[PDB]
Design a protein around this motif. Structure first.
Motif, PDB file in Angstrom:
ATOM      1  N   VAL A  68     -44.945  94.224 -37.637  1.00 55.96           N
ATOM      2  CA  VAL A  68     -45.253  95.584 -38.112  1.00 55.96           C
ATOM      3  C   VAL A  68     -44.005  96.085 -38.853  1.00 55.96           C
ATOM      4  N   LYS A  69     -44.199  96.705 -40.017  1.00 58.66           N
ATOM      5  CA  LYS A  69     -43.087  97.182 -40.790  1.00 58.66           C
ATOM      6  C   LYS A  69     -43.383  98.630 -41.161  1.00 58.66           C
ATOM      7  N   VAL A  70     -42.410  99.532 -40.967  1.00 58.16           N
ATOM      8  CA  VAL A  70     -42.690 100.956 -41.169  1.00 58.16           C
ATOM      9  C   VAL A  70     -41.591 101.520 -42.040  1.00 58.16           C
ATOM     10  N   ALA A 130     -46.818 100.251 -42.833  1.00 56.91           N
ATOM     11  CA  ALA A 130     -47.223 101.623 -42.980  1.00 56.91           C
ATOM     12  C   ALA A 130     -46.099 102.338 -43.739  1.00 56.91           C
ATOM     13  N   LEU A 131     -46.447 103.156 -44.725  1.00 54.08           N
ATOM     14  CA  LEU A 131     -45.479 104.006 -45.416  1.00 54.08           C
ATOM     15  C   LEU A 131     -45.792 105.433 -44.990  1.00 54.08           C
ATOM     16  N   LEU A 132     -44.796 106.169 -44.484  1.00 50.44           N
ATOM     17  CA  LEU A 132     -45.144 107.403 -43.820  1.00 50.44           C
ATOM     18  C   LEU A 132     -44.596 108.637 -44.602  1.00 50.44           C
ATOM     19  N   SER A 156     -49.845 105.513 -45.843  1.00 50.88           N
ATOM     20  CA  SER A 156     -50.651 104.414 -46.477  1.00 50.88           C
ATOM     21  C   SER A 156     -50.444 103.264 -45.565  1.00 50.88           C
ATOM     22  N   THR A 157     -51.373 102.303 -45.563  1.00 53.08           N
ATOM     23  CA  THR A 157     -51.168 101.174 -44.676  1.00 53.08           C
ATOM     24  C   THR A 157     -51.786  99.966 -45.362  1.00 53.08           C
ATOM     25  N   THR A 158     -51.140  98.815 -45.220  1.00 53.50           N
ATOM     26  CA  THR A 158     -51.643  97.612 -45.923  1.00 53.50           C
ATOM     27  C   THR A 158     -51.405  96.440 -45.003  1.00 53.50           C
ATOM     28  N   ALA A 159     -52.108  95.326 -45.232  1.00 56.19           N
ATOM     29  CA  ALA A 159     -51.881  94.124 -44.400  1.00 56.19           C
ATOM     30  C   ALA A 159     -51.610  92.973 -45.344  1.00 56.19           C
ATOM     31  N   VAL A 171     -37.332  93.711 -56.335  1.00 59.97           N
ATOM     32  CA  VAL A 171     -38.675  94.265 -56.585  1.00 59.97           C
ATOM     33  C   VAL A 171     -39.654  93.451 -55.726  1.00 59.97           C
ATOM     34  N   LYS A 172     -40.582  94.133 -55.054  1.00 63.30           N
ATOM     35  CA  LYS A 172     -41.521  93.455 -54.205  1.00 63.30           C
ATOM     36  C   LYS A 172     -42.910  93.961 -54.573  1.00 63.30           C
ATOM     37  N   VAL A 173     -43.874  93.048 -54.764  1.00 64.40           N
ATOM     38  CA  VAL A 173     -45.186  93.471 -55.260  1.00 64.40           C
ATOM     39  C   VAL A 173     -46.235  92.849 -54.367  1.00 64.40           C
ATOM     40  N   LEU A 174     -47.152  93.692 -53.902  1.00 62.41           N
ATOM     41  CA  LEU A 174     -48.217  93.310 -52.978  1.00 62.41           C
ATOM     42  C   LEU A 174     -49.578  93.571 -53.620  1.00 62.41           C
ATOM     43  N   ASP A 175     -50.533  92.738 -53.232  1.00 65.74           N
ATOM     44  CA  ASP A 175     -51.902  92.835 -53.729  1.00 65.74           C
ATOM     45  C   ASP A 175     -52.797  93.415 -52.587  1.00 65.74           C
ATOM     46  N   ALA A 194     -44.243  97.869 -54.994  1.00 64.79           N
ATOM     47  CA  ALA A 194     -45.462  98.380 -55.560  1.00 64.79           C
ATOM     48  C   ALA A 194     -46.616  97.700 -54.814  1.00 64.79           C
ATOM     49  N   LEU A 195     -47.631  98.463 -54.426  1.00 65.93           N
ATOM     50  CA  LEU A 195     -48.852  97.906 -53.846  1.00 65.93           C
ATOM     51  C   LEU A 195     -49.943  98.106 -54.889  1.00 65.93           C
ATOM     52  N   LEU A 196     -50.652  97.037 -55.268  1.00 68.18           N
ATOM     53  CA  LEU A 196     -51.476  97.163 -56.447  1.00 68.18           C
ATOM     54  C   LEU A 196     -52.991  97.050 -56.089  1.00 68.18           C
ATOM     55  N   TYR A 201     -52.161 102.295 -57.916  1.00 68.61           N
ATOM     56  CA  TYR A 201     -51.075 101.606 -57.277  1.00 68.61           C
ATOM     57  C   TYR A 201     -50.208 102.633 -56.568  1.00 68.61           C
ATOM     58  N   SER A 202     -49.453 102.159 -55.600  1.00 73.67           N
ATOM     59  CA  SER A 202     -48.497 103.083 -54.899  1.00 73.67           C
ATOM     60  C   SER A 202     -47.174 102.460 -55.140  1.00 73.67           C
ATOM     61  N   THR A 203     -46.098 103.250 -55.077  1.00 74.48           N
ATOM     62  CA  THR A 203     -44.803 102.639 -55.306  1.00 74.48           C
ATOM     63  C   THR A 203     -43.806 103.407 -54.454  1.00 74.48           C
TER      64      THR A 203
HETATM   65  O1  LIG Z   1     -43.964  95.460 -47.454  1.00 76.84           O
HETATM   66  C1  LIG Z   1     -42.730  95.603 -47.604  1.00 76.84           C
HETATM   67  O2  LIG Z   1     -41.947  94.702 -47.232  1.00 76.84           O
HETATM   68  C2  LIG Z   1     -42.230  96.763 -48.186  1.00 76.84           C
HETATM   69  C3  LIG Z   1     -40.860  96.893 -48.388  1.00 76.84           C
HETATM   70  C4  LIG Z   1     -40.347  98.048 -48.970  1.00 76.84           C
HETATM   71  C5  LIG Z   1     -41.198  99.079 -49.351  1.00 76.84           C
HETATM   72  C6  LIG Z   1     -42.568  98.958 -49.154  1.00 76.84           C
HETATM   73  C7  LIG Z   1     -43.075  97.802 -48.573  1.00 76.84           C
HETATM   74  N1  LIG Z   1     -44.380  97.639 -48.362  1.00 76.84           N
HETATM   75  C8  LIG Z   1     -45.181  98.630 -48.741  1.00 76.84           C
HETATM   76  C9  LIG Z   1     -46.128  99.136 -47.858  1.00 76.84           C
HETATM   77  C10 LIG Z   1     -46.965 100.172 -48.253  1.00 76.84           C
HETATM   78 CL1  LIG Z   1     -48.141 100.797 -47.157  1.00 76.84          CL
HETATM   79  C11 LIG Z   1     -46.856 100.704 -49.532  1.00 76.84           C
HETATM   80  C12 LIG Z   1     -45.909 100.200 -50.416  1.00 76.84           C
HETATM   81 CL2  LIG Z   1     -45.771 100.860 -52.004  1.00 76.84          CL
HETATM   82  C13 LIG Z   1     -45.071  99.163 -50.020  1.00 76.84           C
END
Ligand SMILES: O=C(O)c1ccccc1Nc1cc(Cl)cc(Cl)c1
Ligand SMILES: O=C(O)c1ccccc1Nc1cc(Cl)cc(Cl)c1
Ligand code: NA
Ligand code: NA
Lengths: 115, 116, 116, 115
Positions: free
Chosen positions: B5-7, B100-102, B108-111, C5-9, C100-102, C107-109
């Protein structure tokens, strides 16, 4: 409307239509009393959930049935649903918009709380 | 490590440190059985919740105590917590990162799910 | 590494791999001078863009070619790219992670900024 | 309105009021021709930016002045502004809502594109 729900689809760039939403209030039980429910409209909105009279201070849970939404679209989702749990007050601003932006493996949720 | 889990904190542009996290697994009945708990480190990460062997197929709920986090900073946030509920390992073992980004009134939350 | 820079799908729950990234620095005039470029790796990360010495105070723009990414998957996305523009190192050297989450229409950043 | 902008504040849970928004169209120059501008209303919305007649197909940029917003609130921000660049079509749906949810070190942006 003291409480409304708005749901957006991030894959298609549209309102999320026909999404099931259930609202619950926490009882003295710490269990979840059903409170209201509905499906989002053509504009991704759910109105008319409750009235100022019945929407007393307390902890509420809004459950958005995101998995049924994606399955109906033929897209594989990650989450079972998106839940939003918050205390509803009296002290401050009174109208609550709970918004959720949906993707298959992510969602963002915010509240806009106004007078 | 199959479940991490990363927050992140969107106000300060930082990891969200010392955030309490409880994990639960749903039983053939529908109550939530406690599964693992911990708190995020200095990098906003929580590792070592479980093992491949123990982390069988099922529905899991990751509950992140965002309210205590904000309250410790003097802020009365909107949410009581952020809960993430998902089926895991239903097509074989995978590794799950739950992020989770708070913000006080949003998260927002992503997997990220990968096959080792 | 002072700039990563880190980019997620968000559709597939994965790193966004082979995403082109161009970085620019604003001059005392207001055009954008090319600064660094690269593409994300298998983990969705791009490192080695710059050094502490070269990465002086200034306004930087990180442009992530999200459209080619989606188009390679057959998708016609909403955005031409995602651009992140920020002042860096104005109070001393820091390390910046730009994430960035795409999704096709969103997208969120976020930035994680730390002091080494 | 063929084009509208809606901006939300994630720290206060409110519309982002009085945020400056500039819109540009890319010229054959590949330079950015000013196209429209405005400040968001009390509801975080900017309407009346253009008309169906003048909003022809092309690449547009929407610039949201997020830094001035946070500075006015006394909160330290990360970004200079939030830019959204997209092609505006004719083929498909015609009304564009560009939404942005703002925090001091993050923002999310989405488009709702409808008929
Ligand atoms: O996943 C990561 O490692 C990460 C690292 C730094 C910032 C954000 C990160 N994820 C992230 C998670 C959410 Cl919910 C939104 C965004 Cl833009 C990045
Ligand atoms: O679009 C709207 O109408 C809306 C209204 C209230 C809150 C949020 C809204 N959108 C929205 C936009 C982003 Cl980028 C994230 C989230 Cl959660 C909602
Ligand atoms: Na949730
Ligand atoms: Na942007």
């Amino acid at each position: 409307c003291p409480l409304m729900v708005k749901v957006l689809d991030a894959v298609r760039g549209s309102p999320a239509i026909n999404v099931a939403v259930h609202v619950f209030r926490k009882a003295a039980d710490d269990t979840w009393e059903p409170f209201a429910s509905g499906k989002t409209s053509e504009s991704g909105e759910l109105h008319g959930l409750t009235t100022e009279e019945q929407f007393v201070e307390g902890i509420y849970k809004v459950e958005i049935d995101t998995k049924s939404y994606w399955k109906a679209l033929g897209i594989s989702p990650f989450h079972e649903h998106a839940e939003v749990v918050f205390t509803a007050n009296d002290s401050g601003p009174r109208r609550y918009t709970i918004a959720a932006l949906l993707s298959p493996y992510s969602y963002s949720t915010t509240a806009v709380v106004t007078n």
